[PDB]
Amino acid sequence: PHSHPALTPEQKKELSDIAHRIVAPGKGILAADESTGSIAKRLQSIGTENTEENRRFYRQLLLTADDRVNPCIGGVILFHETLYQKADDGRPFPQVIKSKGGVVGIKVDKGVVPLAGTNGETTTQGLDGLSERCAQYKKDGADFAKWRCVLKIGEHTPSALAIMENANVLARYASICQQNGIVPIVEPEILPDGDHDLKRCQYVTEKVLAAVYKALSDHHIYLEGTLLKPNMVTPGHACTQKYSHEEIAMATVTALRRTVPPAVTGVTFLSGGQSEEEASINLNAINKCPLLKPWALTFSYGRALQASALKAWGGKKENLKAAQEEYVKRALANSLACQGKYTP
Amino acid sequence: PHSHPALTPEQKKELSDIAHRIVAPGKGILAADESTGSIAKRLQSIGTENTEENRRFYRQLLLTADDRVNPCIGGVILFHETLYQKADDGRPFPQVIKSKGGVVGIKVDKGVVPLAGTNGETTTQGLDGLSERCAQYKKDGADFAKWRCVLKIGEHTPSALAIMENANVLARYASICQQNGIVPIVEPEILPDGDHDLKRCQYVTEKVLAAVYKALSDHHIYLEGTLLKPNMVTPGHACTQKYSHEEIAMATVTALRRTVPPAVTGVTFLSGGQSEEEASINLNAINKCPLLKPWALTFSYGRALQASALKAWGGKKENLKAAQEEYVKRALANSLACQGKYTPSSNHAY
Amino acid sequence: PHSHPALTPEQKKELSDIAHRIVAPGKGILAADESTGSIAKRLQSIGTENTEENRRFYRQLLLTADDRVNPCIGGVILFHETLYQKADDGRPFPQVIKSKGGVVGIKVDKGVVPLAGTNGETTTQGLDGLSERCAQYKKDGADFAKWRCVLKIGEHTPSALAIMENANVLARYASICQQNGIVPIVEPEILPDGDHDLKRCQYVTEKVLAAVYKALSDHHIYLEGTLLKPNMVTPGHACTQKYSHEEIAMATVTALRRTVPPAVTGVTFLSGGQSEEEASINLNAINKCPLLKPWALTFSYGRALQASALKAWGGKKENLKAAQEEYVKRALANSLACQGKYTPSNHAY
Amino acid sequence: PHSHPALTPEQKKELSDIAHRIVAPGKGILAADESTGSIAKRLQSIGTENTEENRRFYRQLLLTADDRVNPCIGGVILFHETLYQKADDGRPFPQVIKSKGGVVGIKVDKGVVPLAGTNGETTTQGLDGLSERCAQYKKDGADFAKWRCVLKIGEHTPSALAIMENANVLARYASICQQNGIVPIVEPEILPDGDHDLKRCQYVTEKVLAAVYKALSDHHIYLEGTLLKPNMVTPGHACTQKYSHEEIAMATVTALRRTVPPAVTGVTFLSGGQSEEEASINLNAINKCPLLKPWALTFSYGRALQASALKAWGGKKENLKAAQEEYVKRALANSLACQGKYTPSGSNHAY
Ligand SMILES: O=P(O)(O)C(c1ccc2cc(O)ccc2c1)P(=O)(O)O
Ligand SMILES: O=P(O)(O)C(c1ccc2cc(O)ccc2c1)P(=O)(O)O
Ligand SMILES: O=P(O)(O)C(c1ccc2cc(O)ccc2c1)P(=O)(O)O
Ligand SMILES: O=P(O)(O)C(c1ccc2cc(O)ccc2c1)P(=O)(O)O
């Protein structure tokens, strides 16, 4: 019952200012932090070899798009390798991001691991030496981080253990980040896999998030210096029933209103399995929902910003401009969506 | 991880409609739910005998104040006895309240009891037969309820046990109320007793409220059909340091923003040990605080609405108009305060 | 992290002494604490009218059985009404129990109530004014109490909420009891209803008991001054897979060994739906189980001590002795069973 | 509310057999798992250079003691480095341990880290890639592991957060170990630092252990395949009041009886700040305590087995037998203590 402040007022101000820059009006996050094993599949899908150069080039493609994205992109999440790579003009990618008015983010988790005694549930690892890494990332231009936990809706999942453990590791990660001047993005993703309906997803999302913010409270996390990256509330991929974008928006905003304290600076939705357009329309519906929403509601999109660019590129240097144009298309669409002004 | 809905959509709409009516803009709650043993202290302090009639008359005095209070009072909390009493003209008090545009509330807890193994901490009892009582109260005109838990800031308090137990009993009470169409007011009062400073109170309040809303989630409570009745964040009574109303306001709004989900319909502050004027000024500062507040921020005042009326009355029938006038003045002041329009005459430091 | 002792050494000794008397070797508990609504069903089943007199008479029948039961019965749980009734010789029943060497117990809970938002799960009420009632019961001869929580094995039950809520109310009840010199019997009964198998019951029992004793710890309960009244670990009533009494015993003792601190003075099993004989055989197997058991393992039986006596009585005054003889028969059987003296792959668990 | 078994019957049997071998009657654990940075302090204190060779030689000194220790030592905990070092005859140290009838253990945690928002409290790290490490250690001869959490008794500590977090990380570590056939030693150490009295330590130990075993339950840990390594219940170092060994034993055994399920195979006490002799006397008092104790009560001693041997050695090879002799002497003393048979010649409700 005694306060031993985790953060000084100066530390708090820094975190809050960073968090606010990332989700400033009209702005969202480009998620380009695919691990080498994850980006491999994407290159493979356009018949491109998974080399450091192709990864460097593709990231350059995204990060060096014209200045039309500048007001659309408040932050860019990088994977470790990309943080220390350079553009053709010799500029480190973090410098490229900052020069276009963006904040640099770093994915810091080390993937999921199985929870014994559960039906295929996982927790996430990556806490070991995390404090030193965060200090180093901070020096090298990073101001926020990402940590992904994954939960599954099934007959017996997500279990009490899975919810409790994932909420706890998220809280530990968030605590270490804030000690090093890094804004943590808390990502408790509930997968869309399954035949569950919308209100089951809403129920699970509400329970997961209540657990998350209790955990953050127990660990003395400064919410104004954090962001939330949740799934939208949607039916499962195999659900036959159909819902309008307004119903999805209503269920999403409702779940958040019942669990997310106003002090949280912003919510940066993941797109999950949604198409580029679907992701933009839902985000727009969410921002048009008439209920009171005391946090920024924007995007942290990977696929939903990149899918078309990757295809237009096709691994061919000459299609650079064509590819970039597709990315700018989505960045502009989503900058409008997070203001509720997007009309396809 | 499977939903067995506690409430149907219609039950939800009813609770939500009630909750919103109580804290509509400019409106707050008159807390007149003092137990017979509690009102005894009030009457004795003005040299008046504690009889059922004097209790009936005093409550009548408040409930029949002129129509200037109508837009000020969205709800009135009554103690059991008063719910079944009548005004001089034969009208049941609940009818008196409703005809003036108010919602009728009922205090349903049965007081604090000691928690063994703690430094003088308590939980609250009153769950036994609560469902039957609530159904009966609902039938008899009550639409919301009050349940008071008490926590104290000390060297080793509030303990983990006290916080967990009180949050859990509050959630049980809220669940039972909502099954019977009653809106529960959740009151986790942190007493002002002690020499703690403002930021100690803010810390404890944040921890208490986080535990409260985790418990409400675990018990499947419909937040849109609830109200919160917390202490304002203030220094302890014995704290020598001094604070402005703006700091009190900032600390209060900050604690709430960090713990109370937007879905909560409203926050109805208790006045605690504050004077009538102090309570109004603080509530006004809270509503002027520039930070974003996604819930109604209003009052659930007992002493802060009644203190002057009670004194002007003095147990004498002939002081009716003078006494009622004091009550109306405070009702008017607080209706302005809960809109941030009352006149008595940002920082990451929190 | 600071101690504010709930009990003095003297209070502790009293509670511990009581707990040990109740479960002394060879002894168990007669559960005669059926509420008026529950005993109604039994009287009805033998075509007897549910009157205060028939209830008084039936209870008298059990409490005044001959001295062969004295070493068998360490405790008798009564319902409120019975606590204040008298035998034909004018003696209050508590005095009748004590004179036969028994400890007097009182059921203090006020029944189950539904938990909203769950699939038919309940918690238990009865905390209001419980401290005053306990103080009064203590004056009137009661030295221990009973509080029954009920949990159900289903597709989505027992839920996290149900386990947490029932464990917490049990802890509150135990705390209040110990403040008033009453030994609380903690009964988190997991019902046998359903077609679940033995290891599901063992799993649920292990999880419930872990929750119970964490709760008891959080509420500063003095375990040496408590008793546990759990279900035995058995398959569901409708389970098609068959088990031996040795497997039931192994699963039961394993579950307890994994959850029940040694400091707990005794385990007094409820018989549930088991027959009189089945209850005795299982209890005997439990005590024969070769694993180490650091608590007394005995009985708190209602049906398993009374079923035959009730039928033999049949509501006829003249059948008193015949009825009593049936009860004595079961008391003797279970007194042997709780010593492992009754004759009618450990890692697989 | 549905079981998805973490372990098969065969996995359970393996873990149980290992746990039982380690704490068989008369046996305890030699804790020789001091990290390179921790062992540095011990060598410096005897004016010896902290080199890999000197560390190898010193560990060799302990592990190759004569066969009088064989019935005394059920297990030996090694630090990573030592697990892959060899004796002079080319034998890997794990084989030396096994040939003397001992089980091989490995410390797998990566030290404490600060918990933000607390008064100097910590949790422990080391879970990352722990499964892979455990699989490798198993392959390389290790059958059990050690993970140390540290809690401190102060005015506002151990806090709820500290207790919960450390209990939870211990449960994660135990879960991963058991998936890889490794018996986890659960060590929730409450430091003796401070001026608190005996009953404060007993109170805190009881609360910590209750949290530990709830956490282990939540994470589906197989208790029969675990060991507990707790502090004894003692007053703080700076406590002015004095207590007998009988009182220390009573408080220690009482705390365990109130929290540790019978299914736990054994309790291997840490000696903490105790002298070699004090550690043996207390352990002996614990085993003579008349209360019922349904688990093995033995030792997992570092300093209390090594202190005298290390000084007698002084870093000089010619003092080998003398140094070993001091180690053997403590091993024999503690083998007797964990049977309640140790002699220097060789109210219950108050708690
Ligand atoms: O065909 P692909 O390359 O897998 C493509 C896709 C899928 C996931 C992606 C994830 C990313 O983070 C970035 C780009 C992606 C692109 P989609 O599945 O949307 O067609
Ligand atoms: O003379 P008292 O009884 O102390 C008076 C007082 C105190 C507490 C009160 C509490 C109430 O709920 C209603 C009226 C009160 C009136 P105050 O302290 O405000 O003068
Ligand atoms: O015919 P009944 O009343 O159901 C009879 C019975 C059943 C439950 C009983 C429960 C008791 O607590 C005491 C006596 C009982 C007696 P049984 O079913 O065992 O024959
Ligand atoms: O002089 P040192 O090296 O500090 C010695 C000591 C202290 C702690 C020790 C801890 C160990 O794990 C193994 C040996 C130790 C030896 P002590 O303090 O007992 O004399």
PDB file of C-alpha atoms and ligand atoms in Angstrom, chain B residues 31 34 41-42 45 302-303 306-307 310-311, ligand 2:
ATOM      1  CA  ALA B  31     -27.928  10.480   0.306  1.00  0.00           C
ATOM      2  CA  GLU B  34     -28.484   6.961   7.396  1.00  0.00           C
ATOM      3  CA  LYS B  41     -26.028  10.749  16.159  1.00  0.00           C
ATOM      4  CA  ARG B  42     -27.406  13.492  13.901  1.00  0.00           C
ATOM      5  CA  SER B  45     -26.258  16.599  18.065  1.00  0.00           C
ATOM      6  CA  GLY B 302     -25.328  13.209   2.628  1.00  0.00           C
ATOM      7  CA  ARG B 303     -23.740  15.636   5.079  1.00  0.00           C
ATOM      8  CA  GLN B 306     -27.910  18.206   4.883  1.00  0.00           C
ATOM      9  CA  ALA B 307     -25.544  19.756   7.443  1.00  0.00           C
ATOM     10  CA  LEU B 310     -30.263  19.923   9.940  1.00  0.00           C
ATOM     11  CA  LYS B 311     -28.897  22.804  12.042  1.00  0.00           C
TER      12      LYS B 311
HETATM   13  O1  LIG E   2     -23.119  17.415  14.133  1.00  0.00           O
HETATM   14  P1  LIG E   2     -22.743  16.278  13.190  1.00  0.00           P
HETATM   15  O2  LIG E   2     -23.635  15.072  13.457  1.00  0.00           O
HETATM   16  O3  LIG E   2     -21.287  15.895  13.434  1.00  0.00           O
HETATM   17  C1  LIG E   2     -22.937  16.867  11.483  1.00  0.00           C
HETATM   18  C2  LIG E   2     -23.106  15.718  10.572  1.00  0.00           C
HETATM   19  C3  LIG E   2     -22.123  14.751  10.474  1.00  0.00           C
HETATM   20  C4  LIG E   2     -22.301  13.674   9.625  1.00  0.00           C
HETATM   21  C5  LIG E   2     -23.465  13.563   8.876  1.00  0.00           C
HETATM   22  C6  LIG E   2     -23.647  12.485   8.023  1.00  0.00           C
HETATM   23  C7  LIG E   2     -24.816  12.382   7.282  1.00  0.00           C
HETATM   24  O4  LIG E   2     -25.000  11.333   6.442  1.00  0.00           O
HETATM   25  C8  LIG E   2     -25.795  13.356   7.396  1.00  0.00           C
HETATM   26  C9  LIG E   2     -25.613  14.427   8.249  1.00  0.00           C
HETATM   27  C10 LIG E   2     -24.451  14.533   8.983  1.00  0.00           C
HETATM   28  C11 LIG E   2     -24.269  15.607   9.831  1.00  0.00           C
HETATM   29  P2  LIG E   2     -21.487  17.860  11.036  1.00  0.00           P
HETATM   30  O5  LIG E   2     -20.221  17.139  11.481  1.00  0.00           O
HETATM   31  O6  LIG E   2     -21.422  18.110   9.535  1.00  0.00           O
HETATM   32  O7  LIG E   2     -21.586  19.198  11.764  1.00  0.00           O
END
